[PDB]
Every structure is written in structure tokens, then in C-alpha cells.
Design a protein around this ligand. Structure first.
Ligand SMILES: Nc1nc2c(ncn2[C@@H]2O[C@H](COP(=O)(O)OP(=O)(O)OP(=O)(O)O)[C@@H](O)[C@H]2O)c(=O)[nH]1
Lengths: 90, 81, 86, 193, 88, 73, 49, 83, 87, 48
């Protein structure tokens, strides 16, 4: 059969180029412009402003995170009204 | 020597398996090994913190809680100083 | 049919009580009724034992072995740490 | 001369298949003739800088299209349909190896320049053009049951009323469900403009 | 350039029989030092003459050592395998 | 089917710092990777929280062991 | 100046260099591999086209 | 079960209330108008009472459109139906 | 046999499932998925050290649960009958 | 009220209709000899 990726993975893939905030399972949240995405949610960011829950604010460039350690991701509001969300009734 | 051939040769022989939780060890005659590395052993004795907790008998252990496995022939269960 | 599944099937057919040590710090003495390939088990006449440390007025006392009786129990194979057929 | 970035769209491939009726290797030769003519006049516009703005399918700035049936593809997208249908294919390197005087040996599973196994055709021909020719020929040449069997064998499904359509509209539906939308054109514009 | 696959690196280490020290998964003070004897598709490595080393929690130095002989470790318990180059 | 390989072709043969579980750091040069993110690197230097760098040379980190990566160049 | 066949293979190497030697998986075939190029009615089909 | 206003409980104990927009095979849920409420237990000691009261203070932060992986998702409950 | 088929045959019943996180939810099961994800109606959930909360329904994933206890009058012999076709 | 014919049947009917059926393939055959041209010539009092 034909493999169907998830709608949330499609929304992650369509979020490339816009600034998103990814919080890992380690309590560190980095907000920056996503530069790539993969089907396994392994995303690479360029701006990456990182804030760690112990209170550590820093900046880093070209940071890649695997999908396993990634807990939550927040994307821009415009993608809330994306073409993917329309229920195709053929 | 592949790990599957090593487990096949370790069958019907005394082996000691150290688990990943609590640093426990189980020494006994390995009876059956599955494709998913599921272990079934006979005459098993459990030891905790280098102290023998006691013999249990026929023990079935899944591969998830198993950390390391070795032959029990010529191996000392006491920790070297 | 020839590995630990054979031992589980033999224990289920013999209806013999076996002790399963669960990774949440629990023990379960129960008779095997049904088993799956992913180590998921359904058992009858289960006695579940655990050790609870009573903290009275901020002082940690001696642990107590608490026990409970369950008529029918269903345990997932993921939470199973060790099994011993008795 | 204004130095606006330039991309190429070869159009009306059905004329290669249905008007001229040339064999697939001659279709490759016709495609390469058009591409070299475009690059020749680019080179003659500004001498010496024709390599900087070279248009060739392996770079991804040439998009083969038939606009009547409504399909367009680059080499990268066609290798992407390979990677979707089979799995585990490096799309970029395969699209690099697809175009040119590259011959495919199936027994050795390799890319050479001369036919090593005495009958190996081009990489572009064997992988790209002969599937399109076979799609066209079998879509307009077969009855509805044979068409259903063949297109289900590839994995294309149509409602049974549509299998008995006119050849032009059936052709449009088949090519639409085979190639898919114009994502290849979008990729070409994003990467090269 | 030429990439180094992990399977190719494991095959080269097994053919050269070089010493390897593997810090365990979820344990930075637990290591296994030995010689690679065999590998499987599930990243389960059987190593001969393996010795388990428990490191000091303060100075990060090797505190306790125990040779377990020829053992086999699954890939889920292995975190960082480094080839200790012998001084030849 | 088969999972897609990670996009790390531009990160090959470059200085990279990888943060792994146990709050460990590895500074090295990328030598290869796999579909299951099994990264093999050369000239590795391991750093604990004490800030001490220990050379190891050729090292390998599994996909589950790898947590974060960042190019140093 | 830099030919594609030269930048991909190297002067007169003809075959791929052994340091990379790109190969496709055994499953990969052309799409209509088993189907013949021309049905006996294809002449008639393009005549009616 | 889409487009229903629900609250989902994360594995870290944080709650997220909002309109569930989409779900996948691996339970990776994308929801809009997300509000993350965390109920942290704080022992506030009054200056006149010696008994410190343990209160579950709820800190709420609006996030908007958020996608959460299914491995860290635990449970969810419907709060309000479609409006 | 498949234990998911037995759990689906064990649906539409009042049970109590304790998860791996220590939270225990008791209620009447409404639906059971092949991946052991169970949605139950009239749920009462108690977390680790938190006060219990009553909700109309609650859905628990098949991975987060640890141990489920059903009523003693469950027809286990009837639910273990092989009904799927032989492959 | 509606018909569908297979490719052999349509080919055979095309071959049988040779004395009548038109051999013009190119629409450019009808340059300045189409309906719009005739109407333009009528409005201009000229004849092609
Ligand atoms: N065989 C074939 N014919 C086509 C295709 N696309 C268009 N045509 C025919 O070619 C004619 C030209 O199409 P147009 O879309 O008008 O081309 P155009 O670029 O708008 O023409 P101009 O703007 O005046 O340059 C149309 O009348 C079609 O009949 C095609 O993809 N294949």
C-alpha cells in the first residue's frame, strides 16, 4: 500500500523557513528559523536561541535535533490556515 | 563468532547474565533462546550486589531487562578489587 | 513454540503459580491463563506484593510488605522485568 | 543581457511521441538538440560566460513538460518517483547520473560510457523516456480490461467508467495520476530562481 | 572524500582486533574494555576478554575493574564505543 | 519502508560538537553516518561537566545515544 | 570546459571510480519493464489519433 | 474526533488545552490555540499560621499552534464540543 | 492468537487501569484500538499524589498503561475463543 | 442514445469510410477560408 505520512509531520515539513520554537525532552527550548526537516522529525535550525529550564539563555547556530529527544514544537500561526488542513472530498 | 552462534553454543551450558537494573546477576544453565533474544534458563541462581540472593529455578527473562551475558565457566561472581 | 513461549505455554497448561517481578518494584504470584508473543499475559488468582516505606511525621520507618488479591489481571510485556515459573 | 536568471521548459513531448513517432533514443537526441541550441544562443549572447549560465537537465533547470496532458517533470522529480515507488534511492546522485552519454548496465548495475554488456542503452532513455513511451502506447493501444490490469500493476487506479473514455481524456487522466501535480516546476523555480 | 559507515568501521575493528572501550547507555561511569570478536544486525557485539570498569563519581577515574571474559552486550546498553589505539 | 537518511552531507568532514546523554560533550570531525544515525567520527575529544578534554580518536555514537549536534565551523 | 561526463567519471575512466561506485538497489527497475514498447494496435491508435 | 476542544496531559505533567486540529498514526497531535497550564504544588507559609499550605498553583501560558510527538503524549480528555 | 482481539472482546466493560506513571483510571471502556489504545467513558483518574478527577471520557495510549484489572465476572473462556480465520 | 466502441471497431469504421472521410489533419489548411474569414469578406464586400 501507499505510505501516508501524518498531517502533523506535514505541518512540520511546511514550516521550513519560518521561525519556530522546539522544546526537547531535556527541558531546553530553542526558538529559531528552521532550515530543514525530515520524516523522523529531525530538524536543523539556524538562528537557535536556546533557553534551558535551569535558567540558561544562550545563542547557537546550525543546531540539529533528532526527533526522539524532541518533545514539543510550536510553529507560526499562518500555517494554522494551511492548504493541508482542507478536507479533500474527491 | 556471531552473537547468534554464541548464544546457540551457550545453550545447554552454565551462563551468567547481568541485568541492566539493580546490577543483579543470574547464573544458571541456559535452556532456550528465541529470535527476540528472550532467555529461558534452568537451575538459575540470582545474586545482588555481589551477594547471592538465592536459587529460583526455571527463570524466563526478556531481552529488555538484560544488559550483558557471558559464560559461567571459569568466571568468578565476586568483584575484583 | 520452542523457546520461552514453550515454557509459558507449559505453565499455562499446567496452571502452575509463577512469580513475575515487575520493574515498578512489584511481585506477582499468579497462575498463567493466557499469553501473547509480545509477553503480554492474562492471569487468574493473582497475589500482588510490594514493599512500602512508611514515612510517619517525617521519619522513614521500617518497610512493610503490602499484598493485594486480584481475581483477573492483565500485565503488559513491556513492564515485565523477570519471570520465574514455580 | 539583463542578467535575469533563466530556466528552460521543454514543451509538447506528445509531439515527440505521437506526431514525430521517433524511437526513444531519437527522442533523447531531439531533446539534447533543443537544449544545446538554447545554450548555444546563450553562449553567443555573451562570449566566455556560457558555462556560468549553462542549462542542462542534470542541474535541475530544465523541466520536460507536456502542457496539453498537463504533466511536467525534472530528472530529480522522476528519480523521486523511483524513490517513492521502490525506496532507498539517492535521488540527487541518480538524477546526476541520469542525463548524458551515460549507459546503464543492469547485470553489473553500473553506469559507463560505452555499452559494456552489448545492448545497454542510455541511462536517460532506459529509465525516463521508454517508460513514458510505453505509458503512452499502452494507454492509447489497449482495451479497458487490459488497461485496468496494466495500470493496476503499476499502481494507478481509475473508476471503471473512466477506463472507457475517449483516448485524449483517458490519456489526460492517466498522465495526471501517474506524474501527479506540478511540484517539479515549483522545485525548479525555488532552486534556480 | 570517503565516508566511514558504522558497519564498515565495526568490520575494520573486528578484522584489526583493536581494543575498544564502550561507555554504557545511561551510565557515564560504566565502561567495557575488550577486543571485538563479532557483531550482529541488531548492534549486539560479542567481545572476547571483556573487562567492566566502574569509574569514580568524583574524579572520573577508573575505580573498580572486573574481567568478565568473553561476553556479549546488546546495542541498547551501549552508548559510546571508542577504539583505544595501542602504542605500537 | 526504509527510513530516510538524515541531511548531514554538508556536515561531513567538519568540526562538530555533539551533546549526548549524561551531559557529555564530544568535539570531533565527522567521518560517516548511517540510516539509524550511527555516527562515526575521528579525532574525538570527550568533555565531562568538569571541563576536562580527553582524546579518544575514532569513536562511534549510536542514534539513540546522540541527543544534539552543532557544527563548530 | 568541465564536461558532465568528465566531472562525473574522470577523463577516460569510463566506469565509475571505485572510491564511490554508486549502485542502485536490486529492486529498482524501469516502470514498464515487463511491458513491451508497442502493442500491435499502436499503429492503429496513432492513426485514429 | 477532530476539531473538538480538548485538554491533553503530557508525560511531564503539563496540561495543554485547545482545539485538536489533526492527529497522526503515531499519535503526534497538532493543535491550535494551545494554552499550557502547569499545576505546580507550592508550600506557602503564612506569617501568622505555622502550618504551610500546599496549593496547586496553575501557571498558564498561551502558545498558539503546537505539534506534540506521540511518545511524550499520555492522555487527553474532551473539554468542550465544536462551537 | 492476538491479545488485542481479546482486549477488544473485553471492551464495553468497567475496569481500572494503572499506568506506568502511577496514575490509575477507573471507568467503563468505550473503545479499544489494535494498538491497545483504550478510550473509556465515565472515567475517574488519580495521579501520583494528586487529588482524583472525574471526567466524562478519557483516552489512554497502549504504551503508557502498566496493568489493567477487569471485573471478576468476565467470560475469559468465551473471550479467548479463536474467531479469526486461519492464515 | 449513447455509444462506445473499442479501438479495433473504430479503426475498422475509419477504414471503411475512406471515400467520404476528410484527409485534412492540419487546421492551418483553413487559413482565410474559415467562417470568420467569410464573414469578414461579406462585411467588406469582397470575395476570397
Ligand atoms: N501537442 C501539444 N500541443 C499543445 C500543447 N500545449 C498547447 N498546445 C497547442 O498549441 C497551441 C498554443 O498554445 P498556447 O497556450 O496558446 O501557447 P501560447 O504561448 O499562449 O501562444 P502565444 O502566447 O501567442 O505565444 C494551442 O492552441 C494548443 O492547441 C501541448 O502541450 N502539446
Amino acid at each position: 500500500m501507499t505510505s501516508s505520512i501524518g498531517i502533523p509531520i506535514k505541518l512540520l515539513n511546511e514550516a521550513q523557513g519560518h521561525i519556530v520554537t522546539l522544546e526537547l525532552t531535556t527541558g531546553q527550548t530553542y526558538r529559531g528559523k528552521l532550515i530543514e526537516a525530515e520524516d523522523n522529525m529531525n530538524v536543523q535550525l539556524k538562528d537557535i536561541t536556546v533557553t534551558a529550564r535551569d535558567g540558561r539563555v544562550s545563542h547557537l547556530e546550525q543546531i540539529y535535533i533528532r526527533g526522539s529527544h524532541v518533545r514539543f514544537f510550536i510553529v507560526p500561526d499562518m500555517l494554522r490556515n494551511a492548504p493541508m488542513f482542507r478536507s479533500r472530498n474527491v | 563468532v556471531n552473537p547468534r552462534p554464541f548464544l546457540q553454543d551457550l545453550v545447554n551450558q552454565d551462563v551468567i547474565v547481568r541485568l541492566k537494573w539493580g546490577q543483579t546477576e543470574y547464573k544458571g544453565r541456559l535452556v532456550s533462546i528465541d529470535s527476540y533474544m528472550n532467555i529461558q534458563l534452568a537451575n538459575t541462581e540470582e545474586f545482588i550486589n555481589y551477594k547471592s540472593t538465592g536459587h529460583l529455578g526455571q527463570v524466563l527473562i526478556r531481552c529488555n531487562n538484560v544488559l550483558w551475558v557471558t559464560a559461567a565457566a571459569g568466571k568468578q561472581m565476586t568483584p575484583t578489587e | 513454540a520452542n523457546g520461552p513461549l514453550s515454557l509459558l505455554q507449559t505453565a499455562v497448561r499446567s496452571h502452575t503459580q509463577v512469580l513475575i517481578s515487575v520493574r515498578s518494584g512489584r511481585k506477582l504470584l499468579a497462575r498463567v491463563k493466557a499469553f501473547d508473543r509480545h509477553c503480554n499475559m492474562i492471569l487468574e488468582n493473582v497475589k500482588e506484593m510490594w514493599t512500602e516505606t512508611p514515612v510517619t511525621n517525617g521519619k522513614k520507618g521500617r518497610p512493610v510488605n503490602k499484598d493485594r488479591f486480584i481475581s483477573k489481571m492483565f500485565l503488559r510485556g513491556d513492564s515485565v522485568v523477570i519471570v520465574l515459573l514455580s | 543581457l539583463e542578467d535575469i536568471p533563466l530556466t528552460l521548459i521543454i514543451n509538447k513531448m506528445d509531439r515527440l511521441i505521437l506526431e514525430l513517432k521517433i524511437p526513444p533514443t531519437d527522442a533523447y537526441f531531439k531533446l539534447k538538440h533543443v537544449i544545446e541550441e538554447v545554450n548555444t544562443v546563450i553562449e553567443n549572447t555573451i562570449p566566455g560566460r556560457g558555462e556560468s549560465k549553462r542549462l542542462s537537465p542534470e542541474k535541475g533547470n530544465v523541466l520536460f513538460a507536456c502542457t496539453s496532458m498537463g504533466w511536467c517533470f525534472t530528472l530529480q522529480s522522476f528519480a523521486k518517483m523511483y524513490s517513492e515507488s521502490y525506496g532507498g534511492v539517492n535521488v540527487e546522485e541518480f538524477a546526476r547520473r541520469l542525463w548524458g552519454d551515460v549507459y546503464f548496465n543492469p547485470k553489473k548495475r553500473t553506469f559507463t560510457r560505452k555499452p559494456i554488456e552489448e545492448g545497454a542503452k542510455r541511462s536517460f532513455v532506459n529509465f525516463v523516456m521508454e517508460p513514458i513511451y510505453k505509458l503512452y502506447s499502452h494507454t492509447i493501444s489497449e482495451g479497458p480490461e487490459d488497461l485496468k490490469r496494466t495500470l493496476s500493476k503499476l499502481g494507478i487506479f481509475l473508476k471503471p467508467s473512466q477506463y472507457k473514455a475517449d483516448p485524449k481524456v483517458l490519456m489526460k487522466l492517466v498522465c495526471e495520476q501517474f506524474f501527479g501535480p506540478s511540484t517539479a516546476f515549483v522545485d525548479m523555480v525555488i532552486k534556480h530562481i | 572524500r570517503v565516508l566511514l559507515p558504522p558497519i564498515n568501521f565495526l568490520f575494520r575493528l573486528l578484522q584489526q582486533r583493536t581494543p575498544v572501550q564502550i561507555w554504557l547507555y545511561e551510565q557515564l561511569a560504566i565502561r567495557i574494555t575488550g577486543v571485538i570478536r563479532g557483531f550482529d544486525e541488531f548492534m549486539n557485539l560479542v567481545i572476547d576478554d571483556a573487562v567492566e570498569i566502574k569509574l569514580s563519581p568524583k574524579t572520573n577515574e577508573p575505580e573498580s575493574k572486573r574481567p568478565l571474559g568473553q561476553i556479549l552486550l546488546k546495542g541498547d546498553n551501549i552508548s559510546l564505543i571508542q577504539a583505544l589505539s595501542g602504542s605500537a | 519502508m526504509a527510513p530516510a537518511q538524515p541531511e548531514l552531507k554538508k556536515y561531513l568532514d567538519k568540526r562538530l560538537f555533539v551533546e549526548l546523554n549524561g551531559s557529555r560533550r564530544v568535539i570531533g570531525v565527522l567521518r560517516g553516518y548511517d540510516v539509524f544515525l550511527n555516527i562515526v567520527l575521528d579525532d574525538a575529544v570527550e568533555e565531562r561537566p568538569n571541563g576536562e578534554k580527553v582524546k579518544l580518536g575514532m569513536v562511534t555514537i549510536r542514534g539513540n545515544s546522540v541527543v544534539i549536534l552543532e557544527p563548530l565551523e | 570546459t568541465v564536461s558532465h561526463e568528465d566531472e562525473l567519471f574522470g577523463k577516460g575512466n569510463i566506469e565509475e571510480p571505485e572510491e564511490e561506485a554508486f549502485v542502485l538497489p536490486a529492486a529498482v527497475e524501469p516502470f514498464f519493464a515487463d511491458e513491451e514498447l508497442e502493442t500491435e494496435d499502436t499503429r492503429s491508435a496513432i492513426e485514429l489519433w | 474526533y477532530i476539531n473538538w476542544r480538548m485538554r491533553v496531559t503530557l508525560n511531564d505533567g503539563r496540561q495543554m488545552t485547545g482545539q485538536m486540529l489533526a492527529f497522526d498514526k503515531h499519535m503526534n497531535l497538532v493543535l491550535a490555540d494551545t494554552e499550557e497550564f502547569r499545576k505546580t504544588k507550592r508550600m506557602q507559609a503564612k506569617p501568622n499560621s505555622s502550618t504551610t499550605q500546599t496549593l496547586i498553583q496553575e501557571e498558564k501560558r498561551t502558545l498558539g499552534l503546537t505539534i506534540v510527538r506521540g511518545a511524550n503524549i499520555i492522555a487527553l480528555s474532551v473539554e468542550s464540543p465544536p462551537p | 492468537m492476538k491479545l488485542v482481539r481479546f482486549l477488544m472482546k473485553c471492551a464495553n466493560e468497567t475496569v481500572t487501569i494503572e499506568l506506568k506513571n502511577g496514575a490509575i483510571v477507573h471507568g467503563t471502556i468505550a473503545s479499544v484500538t489494535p494498538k491497545m489504545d483504550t478510550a473509556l467513558r465515565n472515567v475517574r483518574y488519580t495521579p501520583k499524589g494528586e487529588e482524583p478527577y472525574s471526567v466524562e471520557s478519557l483516552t489512554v495510549r497502549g504504551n503508557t498503561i502498566r496493568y489493567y484489572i477487569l471485573p471478576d465476572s468476565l467470560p475469559l473462556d468465551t473471550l479467548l475463543i479463536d474467531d479469526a480465520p486461519k492464515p | 442514445k449513447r455509444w462506445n466502441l473499442t479501438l479495433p471497431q473504430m479503426a475498422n469504421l475509419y477504414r471503411l469510410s475512406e471515400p467520404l472521410v476528410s484527409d485534412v489533419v492540419d487546421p492551418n489548411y483553413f487559413y482565410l477560408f474559415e467562417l470568420k474569414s467569410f464573414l469578414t469578406a461579406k462585411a467588406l464586400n469582397v470575395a476570397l
